[PDB]
Write a protein that binds this ligand. Structure first.
Ligand SMILES: [K+]
Ligand SMILES: [K+]
Ligand SMILES: [K+]
Ligand SMILES: [Mg+2]
Ligand SMILES: [Mg+2]
Ligand SMILES: [Mg+2]
Lengths: 82, 140, 113, 131, 140, 140, 140, 140, 136
């Protein structure tokens, strides 16, 4: 018998995909222990997701301390030279 | 000290040589101008062992992704040790009087929880978010 | 006033989440501490039926949508502009009580013709 | 240790460039050219800086460099203050020109930080092999 | 100690050799600078036996799915033992005076419930969620 | 001092010569009319090492993009050091009495948290927003 | 004094001759009828240097375009210096008694904040809007 | 006095002859039955100079076009001077005792703020709307 | 920095070319065309007379505490020079609100290079290529 959490079943679970996408979008680094609970790491097999911060939108967004030109929130991967 | 008090677990403290323990004891004794010289070694060792145990069981883990021991773990474990030694001595002295000579200290009604009841405890308490509950979780 | 309404709808027309962290008169929370909280409650990651579990010292407050009658302001602007250009109010997709029928209608349409 | 790093490396700037990682690299790590468009972690004393790595990469993967003419959050291995010039420490951090054996820096501190904290800095130069 | 105070229940304590009990008594005696040396062995043994029993009956079981004894069970039982000995001695001295001078301690208040009423009890209380009621349960 | 107390972290302090440390110790001793002369060097060194550690771990970072240590970092560390030394000396004297007469000081006793409990701590507390929580952060 | 205490910043104070410093010290000593004559020169220098540093960091800047130091900056820095010297001496005396009589001073504090704790601090506090927050700012 | 204390600013006070200053000092000394004779001239001069400066910077300007110094500016500056001298002497005497008897005064725990702390300050405070905020202003 | 046309005085536009506009807090009152340096956390003040104090030139007049636009390096600017300068001269903040040559200064490296020569007190055109900070 196979439960939803059983290791052979994880790839069929809509939540396993959705929360791995969520984790990729939400990380700043490959270092999982500093970012995710033991629960999240085990349940969503986060070792095997290519987590590194490269898919977090906030990696690419300007967040300047003094913003004269009203330019914070701009995302560099939307510039014409990209 | 060669191993530092933040680097050792309760099991490690039991595994240290007497000299490694005595270095850590000597460091804890720096936190009082009296050094608690009239309290014997076994009691100071018990206070430190208990502080290490209480750090690792009671002031450990995270509140949201933040560590519950926010300050320096060395000085936290030392202040927690000094709090224990001062309670083994009977508590804070609010007032002391001898051969006419008398002094009164500004200890006051500082609180009712354990750490609030000594100066070392009040110092230690600032390292651990003042025992506040900023923990948060979410469903997935 | 059209630009003012459009800008006011963006700021004020929608509720906004305000998470407050730490106990009142308690230990202070710094920007790096708030970063780890922002991660848990991030609206981009949140979905409709998310549930939250917290200690006592986290408060999920709301900036309510702050009601203002932009419809009445829009009607007033339109009444000003239509009458300034000599058109009946109805040309601006706005109406008024007691002006739809009878001698009150006959007169405004006489004036237009 | 907690190795706490909820840190967005990029503050501001357009000047990101592509290289190949010559080894595994981490977000905010200073790097230098170790082969033809290949980059590796900078050693100390100022022969070796091109920019900082934005995000974690394995060896042989494509990497985004924040170059000079750009603003970044970087960890310092000593206390630093606004107007301090800084350069790679060899430990994956920056240190001041004043602490290093080098005469000149590669970034200018814009917001000060204590040892092991993250400062805010503007990258303004690169350093290579002069012999 | 060979068997630790957290490894023994009440019936185990009764089954221990005199030396195994004396090792545990000696550990409890470290928690006071005075060692309570004027209070007899039987009284210290009764306090420890009672602390073991009271741990296993009042400070056991789950709240939600969390253990109600959150901290180190060894030091909890030792503080609960020291608390009992200090109550058998009459409570906390708030003030002491004689030929050798006077001292007043900052041990004022101490709430109303037993564990609040001595420093060892205040320490023990932190190991056990401060006697708070965080249990939750569901239908299915 | 040649290295100033705001220029050194905990590891740097350990790396200083005895003279560089003694310059900083001597500066801290200027903050009391008594200089705490009856407290030994190791205790003054421990207080400074501990103040440096707390500055870098508890009173660092940013708060709504403002510095948390808004005041002069030199004097903040010296006042934090003086706070520690005065607590190693047992606290503020509210009153002192003997053959040379009696004095009673306006301490008031209204402070209950760590830094509020001595005059040096109350001074240090102004440099760090009085422990207020003005942090603010945004989504993008 | 030749350079006045309001004309010098922390680095300028270090650059002064001993005579220019001693003139400023002598001006500060006018603010107590005792002149704090038992405190050494270094302690008075440290208190002034601290007052200058604290003025320039904590009591500087604008507040709804009004300067935060509204009163005379000379007398503000002198009262802040006298406040610091008085805190190096202990607190304010609430009462003094001895061989030659007794007195009590009504020096009860206005609250728990540092400047409230001495008469010089209470004076200094009037120069700086009583530490109120009247800042206001607009979007454009 | 020939130049009256209300006719001199801080720079004018510095420019007065010693006799013109001594006439004003003499007038201030009339506000106490003791004349503060055991406090030196330079302390009285510092108090007066400070009172002049503080009048011109803290007690100047308008509220709703009414002058903020509504009473006689002479007696306000003299009371402000006497307030300062009494604080340089350590504060009010609440109680005085010795061989010549004992007296206790109706000082009665006057409130938190500077001018409330002495009788001269309480008199001065009536000249300046009791430090109330009756200012009003309009757009046009 | 001013141009004269008949009766009239016109302020010169400081920034000729470049897009390295960047915003800081004024540590003091500053005027258009002044060289500035980092003086606190995101705070800029007028540059001193030798090396180690330059981040850019202020683009508009400000009261103390106001937000300042700088032209940084990678910009071409119109700046007043306190001495005679020629093409290829490296120049440096002068301490007087002007620039001067590296050759005249105690320093050994500039922050901008002169593209068009100018007499003492005239407006030069120069390219800003470097910042300078505390090296010790
Ligand atoms: K889901
Ligand atoms: K080195
Ligand atoms: K020169
Ligand atoms: Mg606190
Ligand atoms: Mg004013
Ligand atoms: Mg260009």
């Amino acid at each position: 018998m196979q439960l939803r959490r059983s290791p052979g079943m994880r790839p069929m679970d809509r939540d396993w995909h959705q929360e791995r996408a969520r984790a990729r979008e939400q990380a700043y680094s490959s270092d999982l222990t500093s970012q995710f609970s033991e629960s999240e790491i085990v349940k969503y097999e986060l070792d095997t997701a290519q987590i590194d911060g490269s898919d977090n939108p906030r990696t690419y967004i300007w967040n300047r301390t003094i913003d004269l030109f009203g330019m914070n929130g701009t995302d560099v991967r939307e510039l014409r030279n990209r | 000290p060669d191993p530092s008090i933040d680097e050792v677990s309760k099991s490690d403290w039991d595994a240290l040589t007497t000299q490694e323990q005595d270095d850590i004891i000597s460091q804890v004794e720096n936190l009082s101008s009296t050094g608690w010289v009239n309290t014997s070694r076994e009691r100071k060792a018990e206070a430190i062992r208990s502080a290490i145990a209480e750090r690792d069981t009671l002031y450990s883990g995270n509140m949201s992704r933040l560590p519950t021991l926010d300050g320096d773990a060395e000085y936290f474990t030392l202040y927690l040790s000094a709090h224990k030694i001062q309670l083994f001595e009977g508590g804070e002295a609010q007032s002391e009087s001898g051969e006419g000579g008398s002094v009164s200290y500004s200890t006051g009604g500082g609180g009712e929880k354990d750490l609030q009841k000594t100066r070392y405890g009040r110092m230690a308490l600032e390292y651990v978010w003042e025992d506040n509950s900023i923990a948060a979780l979410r469903t997935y | 006033n059209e630009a003012a309404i459009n800008q006011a709808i963006e700021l004020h027309g929608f509720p906004q989440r305000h998470v407050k962290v730490g106990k009142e008169d308690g230990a202070p929370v710094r920007d790096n501490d708030l970063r780890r909280v922002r991660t848990i409650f991030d609206p981009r990651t949140t979905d409709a039926n998310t549930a939250y579990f917290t200690g006592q010292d986290v408060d999920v407050e709301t900036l309510e949508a702050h009601n203002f009658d932009y419809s009445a302001i829009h009607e007033m602007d339109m009444r000003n502009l239509t009458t300034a250009l000599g058109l009946p109010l109805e040309a601006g997709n706005v109406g008024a009580d007691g002006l739809g029928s009878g001698k009150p209608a006959e007169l405004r349409f006489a004036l237009l013709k | 240790g907690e190795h706490t790093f909820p840190v967005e490396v990029l503050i501001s700037g357009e000047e990101l460039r592509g290289y190949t990682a010559g080894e595994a690299l981490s977000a905010g790590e200073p790097v230098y050219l170790s082969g033809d468009y290949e980059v590796s972690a900078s050693s100390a004393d100022g022969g070796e800086f091109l920019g900082v790595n934005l995000y974690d990469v394995a060896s042989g993967e494509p990497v985004a460099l924040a170059g000079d003419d750009c603003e970044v959050r970087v960890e310092v291995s000593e206390q630093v203050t606004a107007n301090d010039e800084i350069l790679p420490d060899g430990l994956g951090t920056f240190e001041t020109v004043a602490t290093s054996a080098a005469s000149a820096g590669v970034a200018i501190v814009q917001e000060g930080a204590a040892s092991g904290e993250v400062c805010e800095a503007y990258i303004f130069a690169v350093q290579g092999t002069t012999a």
